[PDB]
């Protein structure tokens, strides 16, 4: 038989929402600091780039990524959420950061380059979190 299963193909899932009109939202001084200080200082770091957008599992040849990671998160998503005033409190935003870092540590192994990058960014994140208003 001549069906060789070359289609249908893989794909990326849809990315996390950055808007939700029915979700409760606030602007708080902590959320303001999270955008202006925490996110913007991590964003400029030379290890930020793999984290600035959702994982493209097709481009990056990580076909197992969304098999293993079922709650993806990334800093582009967090940035957009912050810009859109998506969050109710600082905890929600912080949980998104925690999810991003945790995903990285789940998927990868100690000493992998991506893990060294995540560890550095997490260190910086935790320092910046300790001066939250
Ligand atoms: C942060 C999301 N992420 C991963 O968890 C991950 C694991 C393996 C490779 C890559 C990856 N591929 S990459 O080409 O951009 C890359 C980035 C940083 C360090 C190593 C690699 C890589 O795969 O080197 C071969 C991008 C984003 C992620 C990963």
Curated annotation (Swiss-Prot):
Site (Acetylated histone binding) location in chain? 108
After translation, how is this protein modified? Phosphorylation by CK2 disrupt the intramolecular binding between the bromo domain 2 and the NPS region and promotes binding between the NPS and the BID regions, leading to activate the protein and promote binding to acetylated histones. In absence of phosphorylation, BRD4 does not localize to p53/TP53 target gene promoters, phosphorylation promoting recruitment to p53/TP53 target promoters.
Expression by tissue: Ubiquitously expressed.
Question: Bromo domain location, by residue?
Answer: 26-132
- Which superkingdom does the taxonomy of this entry point to? Eukaryota
Record disease entry: Cornelia de Lange syndrome 6: A form of Cornelia de Lange syndrome, a clinically heterogeneous developmental disorder associated with malformations affecting multiple systems. It is characterized by facial dysmorphisms, abnormal hands and feet, growth delay, cognitive retardation, hirsutism, gastroesophageal dysfunction and cardiac, ophthalmologic and genitourinary anomalies. CDLS6 inheritance is autosomal dominant. A chromosomal aberration involving BRD4 is found in a rare, aggressive, and lethal carcinoma arising in midline organs of young people. Translocation t(15;19)(q14;p13) with NUTM1 which produces a BRD4-NUTM1 fusion protein.
Family note: Belongs to the BET family.
The name under which this protein is listed is Bromodomain-containing protein 4
Source organism phylogeny: Eukaryota, Metazoa, Chordata, Craniata, Vertebrata
Q: Which gene encodes it?
A: BRD4
């Amino acid at each position: 038989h001549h069906h060789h299963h070359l289609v249908p193909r893989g794909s990326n899932p849809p990315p996390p929402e950055t808007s939700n009109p029915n979700k409760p939202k606030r602007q708080t001084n902590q959320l303001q600091y999270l955008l202006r200080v925490v996110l913007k200082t991590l964003w400029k770091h030379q290890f930020a780039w793999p984290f600035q957008q959702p994982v493209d599992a097709v481009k990056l040849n990580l076909p197992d990524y969304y098999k293993i990671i079922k709650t993806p998160m990334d800093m582009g998503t967090i940035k957009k959420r912050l810009e859109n005033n998506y969050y109710w409190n600082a905890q929600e935003c912080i949980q998104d950061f925690n999810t991003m870092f945790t995903n990285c540590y789940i998927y990868n192994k100690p000493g992998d380059d991506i893990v060294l990058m995540a560890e550095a960014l997490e260190k910086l994140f935790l320092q910046k979190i300790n001066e939250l208003p």
